[PDB]
Design a protein around this ligand. Structure first.
Ligand SMILES: Nc1nc2c(ncn2[C@@H]2O[C@@H]3COP(=O)(O)O[C@H]4[C@@H](O)[C@H](n5cnc6c(N)ncnc65)O[C@@H]4COP(=O)(O)O[C@H]3[C@H]2O)c(=O)[nH]1
Ligand SMILES: Nc1nc2c(ncn2[C@@H]2O[C@@H]3COP(=O)(O)O[C@H]4[C@@H](O)[C@H](n5cnc6c(N)ncnc65)O[C@@H]4COP(=O)(O)O[C@H]3[C@H]2O)c(=O)[nH]1
Lengths: 143, 143, 142, 141
């Protein structure tokens, strides 16, 4: 199904790049900020919307009040985080893509959370793969 | 495999950038608004991919052409490289994911297949919509 | 029937646009907002020549006030640091009567399309997340 | 389904604008009105997301000024002068959404577009207050 490719791409690029860069630098760009310990949480909506996950992302922002910061590059990676420990979290925008694929592929909702749980499984497998993400990371489904 | 990733890339990057440019006609080029009279995004696709991904080709092309990087009008910024009539060019980093999947999944022929499939689906989705049609093109068979 | 198309159009355009815009901006015309709850108001029955008289009567009886969306697509809608209690009567329902005049009971039929419109609105509110509790509908009013 | 949507658009927008312009001859300061006709132009094919993109493209290419009618409003697009009204009916977008929830796809959209245009021009011709002072232009871009 066309959910493993999205999971592979999102994990590899975003997660591996950000994790390696921040482990090699230990700092973020809020003005500059510095970090002490790392926890990245992937947030997965229970079901997708008809027109992407932008509205869900904005609702989550207003509900939790996350804060903006890219990686300290002198390839900016703007992310949302909550001498200091940082509890990073994000809702992968790539999930939006899936809905469009479905239009080119109530069975709709049933299929949708099938690919959502498959995406979560692929992410967990890729966490298991590498060591840079071997406990400094977690995922949350049915949100 | 490449089709869903291609759909996602097209949707997000192309529709967002085209819509913002059309509705604003202003890009923060070194933090200063430029005019917009005629433009089009040239998405250029490598013929072959490296074992490590696409970063090397992106670096080589950008250095050869020295394309300046800037975002779109803000008030999430979508940085892009380009050169008044703006000349937008794009190396889609998403292509890297392809090999990753094939690495987890004649090889070089398979990457060729995925690259050409990406090209065709991009061209089809560009042909459909009116926001992009005319203001975007895909340049395969490049280097 | 020709009530699901009207319901879909009304919901999508008006409700989704306004709700998303106010969630993303939190301001109207100046005034600033803290929370949202939009009440779609549905007449218990339709009239011969639309719902203009019903809308004016409701406005006088509740004394609503004007407000548009902070666009920099003016959306003139009626509302009652400050929590706003929004309500609205969809003018599109007027159109429905003409449809019947070009489709042909009348009272029961109109009640049927009104109920179908309400069901479609509730379904679409259930669909999206931007409108997942920030919206309510009110059928059989007065 | 699309027919009722077209009928509603016609009634509300066209009837109200025609009535106001004929009874006032003043639109947004106040401009005079001597002769006019609103050109409802219908896209040949629709985007997946709706009509906003085509509306923006057409308006920017033609640089159409936007203004409302007299008050004591209804916005619209146009260009001692004869008014030349124009409008992209946003309601067209609804069609695709309905057709997406309803269930060749492009051909179904073509059906809806032709039906919308036909019913629009029919209800324009039928009434007297609108006859002559309005036209629908398909086969656009
Ligand atoms: N919160 C966050 N997520 C990111 C960031 N960078 C990538 N991601 C996520 O990783 C997915 C895949 O990354 P990609 O680089 O391999 O493919 C991306 C990339 O090739 C291109 N793209 C998207 N946003 C871009 C951007 N801002 N700049 C340049 N290219 C961009 O479009 C592809 C798909 O975008 P998507 O937004 O739907 O999913 C992203 C996206 O959800 C990031 O800096 N922050
Ligand atoms: N309170 C409020 N309600 C609105 C507004 N815009 C639309 N609505 C509601 O959503 C229905 C359908 O929205 P639409 O945009 O898809 O189709 C509308 C719209 O596309 C068109 N129209 C009206 N005034 C227009 C205008 N000034 N410019 C362009 N199109 C216009 O007339 C269609 C039918 O109008 P209607 O009033 O009977 O039903 C509205 C109406 O009940 C609005 O700005 N405010």
């Amino acid at each position: 199904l066309p959910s493993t490719a999205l999971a592979i791409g999102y994990y590899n690029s975003f997660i591996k790049r950000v994790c390696e860069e921040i482990h090699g630098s230990e700092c973020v760009e809020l003005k500059k900020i510095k970090v002490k310990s790392f926890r990245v949480d992937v947030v997965i909506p229970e079901t997708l919307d008809d027109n992407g996950v932008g509205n869900f992302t904005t609702l989550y922002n207003k509900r939790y009040g996350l804060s903006k910061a890219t990686t300290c590059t002198n390839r900016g990676f703007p992310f949302h985080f909550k001498p200091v420990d940082i509890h990073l979290l994000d809702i992968p925008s790539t999930l939006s893509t899936i809905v469009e694929s479905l239009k080119l592929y109530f069975d709709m909702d049933y299929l949708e959370m099938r690919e959502l749980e498959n995406f979560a499984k692929v992410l967990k497998y890729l966490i298991g793969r590498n060591a840079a993400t071997k406990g400094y990371v977690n995922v949350l489904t049915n949100v």
